[PDB]
Symmetry: C3
Subunit: 329 residues, 3 copies
């Protein structure tokens, strides 16, 4: 969806944000962080509740000295008696920045050019460029080696936003990335060409297989995302589960890498057990899945797992965007 924003950015532009995030994170850890958004007011306007990326946004903003007004579906009826267009045009005159998550990519653009101020196009939850920056910043941080030397793979539905995004990102940064999925769940091959271009001029190793052991070779990072269809009733998942349970990240797929240093990453949320309400619903129809779907309780509750460090890095990545767009240096 919104990875035509991630396509117009150069390796050098993306590297500027990864450096700002790396330094902002270091400043907070060493208590050298100067507030550059002191006295700025920011509206956080969400169509759906999404407490992980809300928090990431609030904490970025508060560390940088800003105030926040969260407006959730709970607290608003935006689009009911008053246009979203009208409400934005009022808030754009009161707030120094506004952040719209949900609502579709179409109207956010409309109320953006009017705006006398920054209007972030789904900077939160969205399989955003910010998600790719967090992931690359996470991998860069853990291997302590040049970005272009980093080896990673995505396992599951290569057609979904994390897969397309992690591949396009690999192609932009000159990294060694492998999409590993069923051959009928591969990106539409014209997309696979736009990535093959960037990769020649940036020198990225692209490699889209359907064989696990191929892709899992000497990778520093194994990635997956939820591949069950939450849109469709649980009753009809059988066919889907059959296609992808090969591509589950289990302890065996970690070992298959024969790199005892390898790390697992996951943008979250992650079906890895039955603690959740939807877990129970799934596992009641599908008792094989008591122990996880795209990834197992074994791997998730193991030291290979750095998804929480990676969720943290969304906060430093969001902050680096907010400071870039409102801090004046």
């Amino acid at each position: 969806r919104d990875l035509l924003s991630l396509m117009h950015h150069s390796e050098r532009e993306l590297t500027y944000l990864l450096d700002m995030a790396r330094d902002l994170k270091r400043a907070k850890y060493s208590g050298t962080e100067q507030k550059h958004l002191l006295g700025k007011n920011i509206a956080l306007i969400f169509e759906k509740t999404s407490t992980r990326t809300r928090c990431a946004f609030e904490v970025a903003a508060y560390d940088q000295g800003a105030n926040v007004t969260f407006i959730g579906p709970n607290s608003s009826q935006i689009g009911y008696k008053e246009s979203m267009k009208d409400t934005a045009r009022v808030l754009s005159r009161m707030y120094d920045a506004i952040e719209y998550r949900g609502f579709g990519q179409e109207i956010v653009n409309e109320l953006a050019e009017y705006a006398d101020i920054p209007v972030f196009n789904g900077l939160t939850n969205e399989f955003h460029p910010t998600q790719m920056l967090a992931d690359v910043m996470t991998m860069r941080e853990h291997t302590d080696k040049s970005t272009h030397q980093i080896k990673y793979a995505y396992f599951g539905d290569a057609r979904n936003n994390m897969g397309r995004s992690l591949y396009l990102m690999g192609a932009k940064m000159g990294m060694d990335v492998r999409l590993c999925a069923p051959k009928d769940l591969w990106p539409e091959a014209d997309f696979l060409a736009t990535c093959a271009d960037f990769a020649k001029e940036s020198g990225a190793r692209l490699t889209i297989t359907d064989d696990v052991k191929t892709a899992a070779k000497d990778v520093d990072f194994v990635h997956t995302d939820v591949w069950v269809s939450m849109g469709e009733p649980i009753e009809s998942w059988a066919e889907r589960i059959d296609a992808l349970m090969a591509y589950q990240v289990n302890m065996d797929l970690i070992k298959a890498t024969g790199n005892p240093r390898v790390k697992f990453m996951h943008c979250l949320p992650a079906f890895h057990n039955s603690d959740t309400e939807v877990g129970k619903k799934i596992t009641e129809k599908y008792p094989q899945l008591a122990d996880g779907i795209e990834v197992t309780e074994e791997v998730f509750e193991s030291p290979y797992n750095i998804a929480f460090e990676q969720a943290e890095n969304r906060m430093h990545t969001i902050k680096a965007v907010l400071v870039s767009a409102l801090g004046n240096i």
Copy 2:
């Protein structure tokens, strides 16, 4: 309703708030704004969701250094197990100010005299004195001429709160105001007398016609508010729409003024098109209204429209009240 608070204020008192709002707005624009509510905590307690006047309040408070606890219907069950009386008496000992919007004008008064602290009687959303101050401050700002010289008219249901309020305000400030409505939708004539008193001693031109071209004469400002009854089902609006569609603000009513400088104002929200969910519902029964009701898409999406500047002025007006009542000078 709450314009018996707007009646006890003198021209000189109202002018003090309009000056504080004008200067506070200038300070924010030139970055000379000193925080006078530093370390104050304010509770914002709302019966209904109302994101435009909530935001206006939050931003006023944050620019002045204050903290805010928003309590919406979402986040509270005030009046369920615990009296509103009890909850207020606890919060009045923790917060430096409380703001009650909704709940009826009756009880807010009760828990106010107990209060060791300021308790604002519907300072938000309410067709408040603050709404009149914003509107007068908006007109004063755009004509750059003495208040008493300003010419404006309200078109639609002269009996509703904006109409009564814009007339009483005109009478207090010595302005040239015209209410223009059907003769059966005119204020109860004892109210029209209390305004005719103030106008003699302040020198205001009052003038309540039912003829558009009369009222729209050489006015600097054309005002309307929503006149459809949201209380009643859409099926039964026909009679109402027939009575008032004359009084719609369309491009022709702007031209009818023969002042190419004239501005349109609207307290919002405004049915001007079908973007809203209630828009669709109305326009499905009433396809003539695809393009707006009290005012047209033509005027609303035109440079005559300064309703958004006017919504902004509610934030500077709210701030001027908050600073007057809590800042200690």
Copy 3:
């Protein structure tokens, strides 16, 4: 429930918190309060809406310079697609402290030892140790005499958390406390033994009667809590009301003390009249209760009533915990 945390604390530990609360309260009143939580971010994660203890927490945090992210049932779907375990482990890397109210005592413990940061086990609403500290701090403040010399009684269902807690607290601090209830609504006598131990070595007068005039003797404080079962339908309360209406706090029970200085305390909320929605429901079945249940409108709207001062003291008690656990001195 969570008074096995209140059992491991010594008289000298509890006295340290009561002193910090007393001094923090004095600092705010005299404007000498230094911010020790400047730049700290705190997550406030609530399963149920609970606006009195939310506010107490927010105000404690803002007076001490902290920021807050409130997450209510309104604004979250914690436990739906994402484990509470997972969400906590992400937020624990962004926030300096987290506060979990509701969710059961079991899992809060789980996600606590992981936590690189303070995780308060139901510091809000919970019949918490913080509730006991507020109550003791309230009584200490009003008698201006040594804690161990203070005389108080609880009237109603001695088996419920306030009763057990006010008794255990009395036993820890060496105070003169009386539980006064029906003999079949007395704590399980093994609990009554653990309290009788502490009381010997601290020198507390314990005394559990069923005779009002005995317990109400020369007490400085009369306490009660709601004893109707909100879990069960109103239709079936008759038997319960019959057992306890003896133990109602009415003007007569105040006089029965023959101390014209005596004060009434109540952790709130308090059924004292029909203003509430649940009031009406109760009083429609039970018209005798128009004027209150555990306590009367006569006492509640009288100067004997200091429940609001006591609710305030939850804010200074919460602050003393927050400053103890995050302020670094």
